Structures are given as C-alpha cells and as structure tokens.
Design a protein around this ligand. Structure first.
Ligand code: OKA
Ligand code: MN
Ligand code: MN
Length: 294
C-alpha cells in the first residue's frame, strides 16, 4: 500500500537544497509511516539486542538537515546500521521531516535500523515544546495524535554485543534486572513515576555516588557507584545514553562508565554545542564523529 521508496526519495530529495526547505508528504503517507512502524516496533522486543558494526546517535530534536549531515558522514542506510536514542521531535524547525525519514528507514530496514523512545516521544512533552505546533501548522492535530500512538510503542532500551546498555535517560532505583524492562507492556504513555519514567528522564550526576535530586523536577540523578553496581550485575562495560545537551556532542560521566550523546548542533539555535555520533566497530571499539555547528 505505502510507497516507501518514493517517500524516502522525496525526503532525501532536499539534500543540497538550502537548509530549512520543507518536504510536504501527503497526510495518508505520514499516517502510514506511523501505523506500519508501530506494527514493527510491537513485533520486536522492547529491549533490543543488537550487534556491531553500528552507528549510535543522540537527540535530533527536529534539526532535519543535521540528521541528513549525520547520514552523509556516517553513511546512508543500509550502508551502515543505526541506533538512535530518542528525542526526534520538538525544539527544532523540522520535526516532521526528521521523524518521517527515521520511521521510513525503520520500515525499509527493520533489522538494520533502530529507534529508542526519548522523553520527547511522550505526548505531554511534545505537545508543549514544538511538535504539536508543527503538526497544527502543517497538517492537523489528529495526525499529531497518530504520532503519539506510534511513539507509545517504541522500544525502551538496547544492549549492543552484550556489553553496551543503551537508553534515553538513565538508571532507576527500581531497576534490578533486565527482565523488568522486557516485561514493560506497550502501548504505554508514561502515566506514573517509576522505572519507565526514570529510563526516559534520569541523569548522571558527578557530585553524588548514589542517588540524587534531579533539577528537571522529575525522576532522579545517579552517581558512579550506582553505575558500577549496574554494569557488574549484568556483566556490561558501558552505558550509552543521550537526553543531555553536551558542548562537544559527546561526554563521559561516572568515571567513563557512561557516555552521553547529543546529535543536534547549536541546540535551539542558542547553544554553540556540537553534535556527535558514536561508531562501534566489530571489535567493540568506540570512535566519535563530531558535527560542528554549521
Ligand atoms: C523539559 C523540561 C525539563 O527537562 C527541564 O529541566 C531543567 C533542568 C536542566 C534543564 C536545561 C536545559 C537546557 C539545556 C535548555 C536550553 C534552552 C535553549 C532552553 C531550556 O529548555 C528547557 C526545556 C527543554 C525541552 O528544551 C529541555 O532541553 O529539557 C527548559 C529550560 C530552558 O531554559 O533549557 O532544565 C529544569 C527546567 C525543566 O523544564 C521542563 C519541565 O518543567 C517539564 C516537566 C517536568 C514535565 O512534567 C510532566 C509531568 C510529570 C512527569 C513528566 O511530565 C508533564 C510535562 C512537563 C510539564
Ligand atoms: Mn531527552
Ligand atoms: Mn533532549
């Protein structure tokens, strides 16, 4: 029914055009991307088990031309396998093009392209920070609600080669075993505090070794001792997350037991931060590709 190759073709057709140029897909096509990807997300585990080689990206926040630059620098699917950590919409000027290209690739390469849920893939959040407004202006609210139903089915975490735990926010004082994550039911909005909330909102903190207070007004912060206990209990080597804007695009925390990735250069057009993508080769060696704020 859905012509994925044509959709991708039109979305990529703007490579080279002046940044900011829109790609206006038909309402039916976008709705189809949501419904089809939703089916795929539900068919795969909520806790993904992936293998390198892989390219991992952090927050994109509707900066579509920067997403294009990422693919330009890392290789357009299926040239390279990808895992995004969430926060595809809000703040930026082109959340629509951004999320549609990502969903399109998920449908086109379901086994080589993966997307995790960020806190911005939650209705209460993308309703206020831009996505709703973009949908209201370019399409309609019914379509925005359709996106919400899609987002409610996104997976929550992934483990790369049994060594790298990936999630959007961070750890939770309720997280004792991976099975707790696998048992999370979808579709799900994030109505209550707890495990899922923390996985989407928590942040690492340098000042405390254990659990601390989070300035976001939700969830908690976690220190190096918490991370160490986590990694050892599940025989992991690193936690890879996003959620926090970092000046260089990537930054290590908790004595390098954790790395934060942010892929949207000059966030909100008010930061001079760079964007970064982390490459994981087949020998489990990590390298970082930086996107200078252009
Ligand atoms: C979003 C957020 C948080 O993350 C944010 O955290 C804080 C701590 C660190 C963080 C700083 C971020 C900066 C780098 C950016 C840079 C720029 C240029 C703009 C700005 O942008 C922030 C929002 C956003 C999106 O851009 C983000 O970057 O986070 C707000 C402050 C702005 O100066 O700060 O600011 C404090 C303010 C807090 O404000 C909101 C928070 O009130 C949201 C609230 C908790 C939510 O509660 C509910 C109910 C409970 C469960 C969760 O859902 C419903 C929905 C919503 C009301
Ligand atoms: Mn986030
Ligand atoms: Mn973010």
């Amino acid at each position: 029914k859905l012509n994925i190759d044509s959709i991708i073709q039109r979305l990529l057709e703007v490579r080279g055009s002046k940044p900011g140029k829109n790609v206006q897909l038909q309402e039916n096509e976008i709705r189809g991307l949501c419904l089809k990807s939703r089916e795929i997300f539900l068919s795969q585990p909520i806790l993904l088990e992936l293998e390198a080689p892989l390219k991992i990206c952090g927050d994109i926040h509707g900066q579509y031309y920067d997403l294009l630059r990422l693919f330009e620098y890392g290789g357009f699917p299926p040239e390279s396998n990808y895992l995004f950590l969430g926060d595809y919409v809000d703040r930026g000027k082109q959340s629509l093009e951004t999320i549609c290209l990502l969903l399109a690739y998920k449908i086109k390469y379901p086994e080589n392209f993966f997307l995790l849920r960020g806190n911005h893939e939650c209705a209460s959040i993308n309703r206020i920070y831009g996505f709703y407004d973009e949908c209201k202006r370019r399409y309609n609210i019914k379509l925005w609600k359709t996106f919400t139903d899609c987002f409610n089915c996104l997976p929550i975490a992934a483990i790369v080669d049994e060594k790298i735990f990936c999630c959007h926010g961070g750890l939770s004082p309720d997280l004792q075993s991976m099975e707790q994550i696998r048992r999370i039911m979808r579709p799900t909005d994030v109505p209550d505090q707890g495990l899922l909330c923390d996985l989407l909102w928590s942040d690492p903190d340098k000042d405390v070794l254990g659990w601390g207070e989070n300035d976001r007004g939700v969830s908690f912060t976690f220190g190096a001792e918490v991370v160490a206990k986590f990694l050892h209990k599940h025989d992991l080597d690193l936690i890879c997350r996003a959620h926090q804007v970092v000046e260089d695009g990537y930054e290590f925390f908790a004595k390098r037991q954790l790395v934060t990735l942010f892929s949207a250069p000059n966030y909100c057009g008010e930061f001079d931060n760079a964007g970064a993508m982390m490459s994981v080769d087949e020998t489990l060696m990590c390298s970082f590709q930086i996107l200078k704020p252009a």
